[PDB]
Amino acid sequence: QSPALIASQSSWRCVQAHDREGWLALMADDVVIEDPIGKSVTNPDGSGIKGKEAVGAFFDTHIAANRLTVTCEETFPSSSPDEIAHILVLHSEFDGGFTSEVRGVFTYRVNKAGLITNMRGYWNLDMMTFG
Amino acid sequence: QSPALIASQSSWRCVQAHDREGWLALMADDVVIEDPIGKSVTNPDGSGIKGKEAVGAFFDTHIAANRLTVTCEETFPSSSPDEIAHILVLHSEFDGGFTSEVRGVFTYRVNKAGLITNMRGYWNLDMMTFG
Numbered sequence: 001q002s003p004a005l006i007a008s009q010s011s012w013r014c015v016q017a018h019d020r021e022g023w024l025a026l027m028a029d030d031v032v033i034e035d036p037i038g039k040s041v042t043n044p045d046g047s048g049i050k051g052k053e054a055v056g057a058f059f060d061t062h063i064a065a066n067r068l069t070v071t072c073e074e075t076f077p078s079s080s081p082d083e084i085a086h087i088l089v090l091h092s093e094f095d096g097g098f099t100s101e102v103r104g105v106f107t108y109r110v111n112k113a114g115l116i117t118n119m120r121g122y123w124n125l126d127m128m129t130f131g
Numbered sequence: 132q133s134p135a136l137i138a139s140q141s142s143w144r145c146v147q148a149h150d151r152e153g154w155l156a157l158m159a160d161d162v163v164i165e166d167p168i169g170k171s172v173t174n175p176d177g178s179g180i181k182g183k184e185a186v187g188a189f190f191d192t193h194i195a196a197n198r199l200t201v202t203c204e205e206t207f208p209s210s211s212p213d214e215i216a217h218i219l220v221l222h223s224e225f226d227g228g229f230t231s232e233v234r235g236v237f238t239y240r241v242n243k244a245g246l247i248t249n250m251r252g253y254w255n256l257d258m259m260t261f262g
């Protein structure tokens with residue numbers, strides 16, 4: 001498996017399993033998570049979640065006590081072992097009850113070491129479904 | 132329509148019409164086209180095709196003698212009006228009836244003037260089909 005595919009697959013696994021230290025272990029010190037790209041509830045100023053401290057902070061307040069499910073519908077390798085794209089379905093479940101789901105394209109970049117430098121999501125709240 | 136969506140649709144129109152100057156007019160002077168991301172036939176050194184002079188040369192090489200079609204299977208807005216992703220199928224025909232086809236994720240970014248700064252493709256020669 002390419003470094004990008006390993007990292008993205010390991011990323012989904014840690015998040016779903018609520019593995020804080022495993023998730024952060026996948027990340028470069030200079031990581032930027034734009035989920036989604038542009039201004040949204042999960043990217044308030046559009047500049048993304050920047051650095052492992054911020055990423056852990058996000059996990060703590062927004063993943064720790066919430067159920068998240070990630071379904072990979074399709075994977076698109078590039079001609080670089082370090083860059084990859086996927087069609088993912090994100091399903092979130094807050095206690096007690098409120099659900100949201102969104103389907104979008106997600107891009108990942110890793111550095112030479114195989115650590116995630118970028119995760120970028122193409123979706124918006126107009127595309128989201130609620131229950 | 133968003134600037135990103137407008138620019139991407141216009142890119143498809145220009146390339147299919149062999150409109151070299153119209154295509155270049157959609158681009159920022161700092162444009163980088165990575166089709167695909169990473170080293171390949173259409174990205175010789177993996178650093179992409181950089182700037183309008185180089186893009187014009189790329190057009191002369193890979194588009195001017197290509198019966199090229201672009202089919203948009205699906206579009207994925209982000210939360211930025213300036214960034215968007217699509218699943219595209221690019222069908223080429225060249226030199227006496229050779230045909231190639233690739234289906235992949237293509238991301239586009241525009242600047243504040245709505246001009247394309249980045250076009251990036253997730254595909255590799257291994258996912259290409261022929262005839």
Ligand SMILES: CCCCCCCCCCCC[N+](C)(C)[O-]
Pocket residue numbers: 146166172173193194197199221223231
């Ligand atoms: C079998 C190898 C042939 C190389 C594939 C043909 C290159 C076509 C490039 C068409 C232009 C693509 N794009 C994204 C700029 O529109």
